[PDB]
Amino acid sequence: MPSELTPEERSELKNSIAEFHTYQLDPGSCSSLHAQRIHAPPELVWSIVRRFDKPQTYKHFIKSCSVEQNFEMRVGCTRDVIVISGLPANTSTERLDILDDERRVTGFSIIGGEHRLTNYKSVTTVHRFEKENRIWTVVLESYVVDMRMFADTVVKLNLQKLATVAEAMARN
Amino acid sequence: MPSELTPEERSELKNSIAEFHTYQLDPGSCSSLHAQRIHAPPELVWSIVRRFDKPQTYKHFIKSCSVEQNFEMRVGCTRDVIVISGLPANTSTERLDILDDERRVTGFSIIGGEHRLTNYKSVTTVHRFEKENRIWTVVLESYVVDMRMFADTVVKLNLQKLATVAEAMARN
Ligand SMILES: O=S(=O)(NCc1ccccn1)c1ccc(Br)c2ccccc12
């Protein structure tokens, strides 16, 4: 399935999973890692997911997102998200933690808002794969949060939306 | 938004919402109604969603679905669903309650399986809208269940998948 790494992909990603997606958890925390294969070039995928100011273009569940205007997003910037009705959250204030255009790493922390999550922090990495003439992408996204099944579903569906957007753009 | 009826659509659907999607609840039950606009002909939408034997073609979260072979699905037939890993459910046995090809109504009850829901029953109706040269669809899906936010998310995402499939098929 597009969310289940092949053994070859898992072997190639061993160092990245260790570097960014493995947690030494206190007894009051939990973590989760999700993967998504995308049949599009990794720089295209990265160009979408790196836009911290426009999460609604690659995520579900967002009614609106406010950032300061006329300013290029950089580490430390925040965004104010209104979550669509019907979820265990109404707003989220989120800080951009990582924006590495060379390595294709981004991540954010939820620092405020009306919701149930304490100390949520996530990291997303975008990886290039190639075999014969064919180049594809794997996206890894993990989070840690204080004490899961709902957040897992949000991440999985968001990664699938990112796949749908990138593959739509890649059609020739 | 595609999940929020216009006042005109809501007025046109008043009788259908009363007929199929309104519940006289005991204190131990709850219900929820979801809507999805689809920019495709209603008979195309119906041809997809009526396939009780192939829910994985218009729903998320399904690893596999087993039905008896060499038999046209009809009211009373059951399906055995395995839910993908990571959800508050592992299996679901579901009975087809309604299959009305003239009125475009279907529905099912969850009668067994390893999951947390008691007495879940849902009904889905497919509606034709037309204004000037333009014909579109609204799908309504409601459920009742014994004592919500997770089931609401499942229904909303499934209706959105149905929209994506039908609109992909309708492109000329
Ligand atoms: O604002 S968010 O888009 N943040 C991104 C996000 C948050 C949690 C998991 C994955 N990704 C958001 C969406 C859905 C839920 Br449920 C949330 C619940 C609490 C806080 C924020 C929530």
Ligand SMILES: O=S(=O)(NCc1ccccn1)c1ccc(Br)c2ccccc12
């Ligand atoms: O097998 S299902 O595809 N049934 C369809 C369904 C079930 C519940 C709501 C909407 N639609 C399924 C999917 C996801 C969850 Br969470 C379920 C949890 C319990 C039982 C079945 C579940």
